């Protein structure tokens, strides 16, 4: 079924996936992670006899478990044609690099390649990069299915999952793909429902971070906090001035959802009901805050009501309404996630965190792809311009010499490869 499974990227996502794969019965389980301090620490832990450990936080404690890794490679030169499934647990903005870098001459036996956090066009981009006559099926999971992080970077094999989604979606480059059911079962082991959809793009159209991170973390407030060294970092999911959520950001969310929905229609995929997707598939609120009739009717409700409902949705989740109250009546503050900020790497160069660099790169690629379908996407373009102007001013102030080149891009080549692949 899954045969021997190679995990590409061994970070927080991979450890959760490894636990679900070992429950199911991979066969051999290996991992590849490019050189660096993390891979060094992993090789050291593995050589010490360490195993992967997943802790579930609070409600999720029942997830907790340990999983053995059979082999770990930080050097593709030692890979052999032993692998039937590849699972990409790297950042989604690196899929193209990572796929180009695999030694496909020694991977003819690969039958399936799973993208754990896909975005519109990712399946096609990955297939554009495969060698001729590669017969691996490429699977797109709509979103990573939990919230997981490596708590202590010096114990790189221990991760903590603090949330699990209710539902995600899975598409495949192979029509009526049988691997979808396999992965349905693997993810079911952690309580998430996988819904198979007919094409990759339908599933990719349900990537939550594209819809949420784009309006909230490419705007002025988020960028100001992220690109700062001194002030308070602020909070990713709180209201202004503690966090980035404002009526303006909600209006960007709505308008971007409309643009992405039209792109999906032009690629033959059914768009989603954004409010019902957030509430039912990701995390709910009470009927008192969002009535069922309002959730189900959201797509026909009219722009003012749509924005009102989205704002309510996020305001209602400043605390967890389903957590127990303390004696004062307070509920758990789970909008208190700090923004990660710029930091210097081991060469002394400023680097951006994945929020927003991955978010920008994904949206920039989507915008470039949309041009091929004659779609201007002005709200997306405005969010890209907001990021570009902010990062530009940070380079102005800090000095280009001090900045990693990832802060300096052209998405049109990759978008052209995607469109050509789509047109084959």
Ligand X SMILES: NC(=O)c1ccc[n+]([C@@H]2O[C@H](COP(=O)([O-])OP(=O)(O)OC[C@H]3O[C@@H](n4cnc5c(N)ncnc54)[C@H](OP(=O)(O)O)[C@@H]3O)[C@@H](O)[C@H]2O)c1
User: Is the bond leading into 230 cis (omega within 30 degrees of zero)?
Assistant: no
Distance (Å, whole) CA 369 – CA 413: 10
Of these, 38, 184, 340, 341, which contacts ligand X (CB under 6 A)?
38
Look at residues 313, 69, 353, 366 and name the one whose alpha carbon lies nearest to residue 207: 366
Nearer Cβ to a second copy, position 35 or 329?
329
CB of residue 377 to a second copy, shortest distance in Å: 24
Say whether residue 12 binds ligand X (CB under 6 A).
yes
Stretch that binds ligand X, among 8-16, 177-185, 245-253, 309-317 (CB under 6 A): 8-16
The residue written with tokens 């059979």 in the block is 70
Nearer Cβ to a second copy, position 329 or 348?
329
Nearer Cβ to a second copy, position 49 or 241?
241
Nearer Cβ to a second copy, position 53 or 228?
228
Name the residues that contact a second copy, by CB under 8 A: 225, 231-235, 239-242, 246-248, 286, 288-289, 302, 304-305, 307-308, 311-312, 315-316, 318-319, 321, 325-331, 336, 338
> Which parts are annotated binding residues?
10-13, 33-34, 148, 358
Of these, 13, 110, 264, 368, which contacts ligand X (CB under 6 A)?
13
Element (H, E) at 32: strand 29-32
Tell how strand 137-141 and strand 167-172 pair up: antiparallel
Say whether residue 67 binds ligand X (CB under 6 A).
no
Distance (Å, whole) CA 413 – CA 118: 19
Q: Which does 248 bind (CB under 5 to 8 A by kind): a second copy, ligand X, none?
A: a second copy
Mask 343-362, x = binds ligand X (CB under 6 A)? -----------x---x----
Nearer Cβ to ligand X, position 28 or 34?
34
Stretch that binds ligand X, among 143-151, 164-172, 182-190, 413-421 (CB under 6 A): 143-151
Nearer Cβ to a second copy, position 221 or 422?
221
> Which parts are annotated binding residues for NADP(+)?
10-13, 33-34, 148, 358
Q: What does the buried/exposed string (b/e) look like for 208-232 if buried means 16 or more CB atoms within 10 Å of the residue's CB? A: bbbbbbbbbbbbebbbebbbeeeee
Beta strands in 70-206 (DSSP E): 71-73, 85-88, 112-115, 137-141, 146-150, 158-164, 167-172, 193-196
Of these, 46, 54, 92, 203, which contacts ligand X (CB under 6 A)?
92
Whether the CB-CB separation of 413 and 364 falls below 8 Å is answered with: no
CB of residue 329 to a second copy, shortest distance in Å: 3
Structure tokens at 207: 């990537």
Q: Which does 242 bind (CB under 5 to 8 A by kind): a second copy, ligand X, none?
A: a second copy
Residue count at the site for ligand X (CB under 6 A)?
A: 30
The DSSP letter of residue 78 is G
Tell how strand 52-56 and strand 65-67 pair up: antiparallel
Give, as ranges, the residues between 146 and 205 that touch ligand X (CB under 6 A). 146-150
Distance (Å, whole) CA 170 – CA 164: 16
Q: Which does 56 bind (CB under 5 to 8 A by kind): a second copy, ligand X, none?
A: none
Tell me how far apart the terminal alpha carbons of the chain are, to the nearest angstrom: 29
Nearer Cβ to a second copy, position 82 or 242?
242
Say whether residue 91 binds ligand X (CB under 6 A).
yes
Radius of gyration of the chain from its Cα atoms, rounded to whole angstroms: 21
CB-count burial class (<10 Å; 0-12, 13-18, 19+) for 176 = exposed
CA angle in degrees (0–180, nearest 5) for 186-190-192: 85
Q: What is the dihedral of CA 392, 393, 394, 397, to 10 degrees?
A: 130
Looking at beta carbons, which residue is closest to ligand X?
Answer: 11
Which residues are annotated as catalytic?
Answer: 213
Stretch that binds ligand X, among 17-25, 50-58, 139-147, 302-310 (CB under 6 A): 139-147
Residues within the interface to ligand X (CB under 6 A) = 8-13, 32-34, 36, 38-39, 89-92, 94, 97-98, 116-117, 144, 146-150, 209, 354, 358
């Amino acid at each position: 079924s899954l045969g021997n499974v190679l995990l590409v990227g061994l970070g927080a996502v991979a450890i959760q996936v490894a636990l679900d794969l070992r429950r199911h019965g991979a066969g051999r389980l290996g991992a590849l992670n490019h050189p660096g301090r993390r891979s060094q620490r992993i090789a050291e832990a593995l050589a010490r006899g360490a195993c992967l450990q997943l802790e579930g936080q609070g409600q999720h404690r029942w997830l907790s478990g340990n999983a053995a890794l059979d082999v770990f490679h930080q050097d593709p030169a030692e890979l052999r044609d032993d692998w039937q499934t590849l699972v990409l647990c790297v950042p989604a903005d690196s899929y193209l690099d990572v796929v180009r870098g695999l030694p496909w001459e020694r991977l003819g036996g690969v039958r399936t390649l799973l993208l754990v956090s896909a975005f519109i066009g990712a399946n096609l981009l990955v297939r554009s990069a495969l060698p001729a006559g590669c017969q691996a099926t490429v699977l797109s999971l709509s979103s990573y299915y939990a919230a997981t992080k490596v708590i202590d970077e010096t114990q790189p094999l221990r991760a903590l999952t603090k949330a699990v989604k209710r539902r995600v979606y899975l598409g495949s480059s192979r029509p009526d793909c049988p691997a979808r059911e396999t992965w349905r079962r693997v993810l079911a082991g952690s309580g998430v429902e996988v819904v198979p959809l007919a094409t990759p793009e339908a599933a990719e159209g349900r990537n939550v971070t594209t819809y949420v991170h784009s309006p909230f973390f490419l705007g002025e407030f988020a960028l100001a906090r992220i690109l700062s060294e001194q002030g308070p970092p602020g909070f990713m999911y709180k209201l202004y001035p503690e966090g980035p959520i404002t009526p303006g950001a909600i209006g960007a969310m709505r308008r971007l959802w409309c643009e992405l929905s039209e792109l999906l229609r032009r690629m033959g995929a059914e768009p989603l009901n954004l409010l019902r997707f957030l509430n039912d598939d990701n995390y709910p609120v009470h009927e008192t805050m969002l009535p069922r009739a309002s959730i189900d009717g959201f797509a026909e409700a009219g722009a003012e009501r749509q924005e009102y409902l989205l704002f309510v949705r996020y305001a209602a989740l400043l605390v967890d309404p389903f957590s127990p109250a303390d004696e004062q009546g307070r509920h758990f503050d789970f909008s208190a996630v700090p923004f990660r900020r710029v930091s210097r790497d081991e060469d002394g160069l400023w680097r951006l965190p994945r929020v927003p660099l991955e978010d920008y790169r994904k949206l920039a690629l989507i915008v470039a792809l949309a041009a091929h379908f004659d779609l201007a996407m002005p709200q997306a373009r405005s969010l890209l311009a907001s990021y570009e102007n902010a990062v530009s001013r940070f380079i102005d102030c800090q000095g280009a010499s001090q900045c990693h080149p990832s802060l300096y891009i052209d998405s049109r080549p990759a978008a052209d490869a995607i469109y050509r692949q789509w047109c084959s």
